Design a protein around this ligand. Sequence first.
Ligand SMILES: *C(=O)[C@H]1[C@H]2CC[C@H](C2)[C@H]1C(=O)O
Length: 307
Amino acid sequence: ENLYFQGMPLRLDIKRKLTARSDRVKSVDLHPTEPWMLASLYNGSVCVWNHETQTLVKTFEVCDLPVRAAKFVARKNWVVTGADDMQIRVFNYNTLERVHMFEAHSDYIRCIAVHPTQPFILTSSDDMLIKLWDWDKKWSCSQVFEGHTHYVMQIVINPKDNNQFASASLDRTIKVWQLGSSSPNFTLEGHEKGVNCIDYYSGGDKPYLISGADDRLVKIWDYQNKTCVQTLEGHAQNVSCASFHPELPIIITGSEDGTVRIWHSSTYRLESTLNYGMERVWCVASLRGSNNVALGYDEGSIIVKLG
Ligand SMILES: *C(=O)[C@H]1[C@H]2CC[C@H](C2)[C@H]1C(=O)O
């Protein structure tokens, strides 16, 4: 695990684009065409920062309980939110209006994933369920995904097969699903404690996803062979978030240890451990065609340009 065994450090140019001090940030999202970062806060605020002006340009009155999930739906001019009061709230970011809301779940909403081509959102909950909603059909529930036996912390749609998606649960399992069926395709076991995050590698050359757990571990999974291909140790606490960068050959992980770790996406060399002094890390967002990465902490959110 040193220069006699591991390759040369990656060149990783790092510039701070935004530092937005706030109450605890539970989710971030980057807008595909506006220079915008979304953040959802413990205090029930959802904020849109312009990372070119470095100004707060929009906020939404969502509720005064935590909002753990917020995403843009760029093609609908929406921010979709999920709150601890079990409501999905859809806002128009042009008019700032709440255009729709409904009761989605019977406990905290942890996560939202927005279908890229179909009028669907997936929601995941402490009620142990994942639900499919069709905004072309009056936000009616298309599907209830049953099988997790604890909180479903995070869900992500396979960007190479939009009929497939994966879930991370405090039941220590990852499940892989297809939209047509209420029962999982399969379960991936290996984490020793609750799984907090799940992401797909976007490249066609590996059928990989990445997870982080309360066991302090990051794991790389082959979703075809249904095996753990790699365990990455070094985090000193719960791993809250994990992503493959879409434009750089890196993996980015964040932890309640207050660090973001950057690893080489093929060799798994530790490139970087960065504690930006905002206490616990909760969430990371990246954007196809961008070097910008959003990070949410106890003490606010930042955007770093990587490479
Ligand atoms: C979110 O607020 C996090 C901190 C409060 C409880 C733990 C630590 C997290 C959670 O609420 O799930």
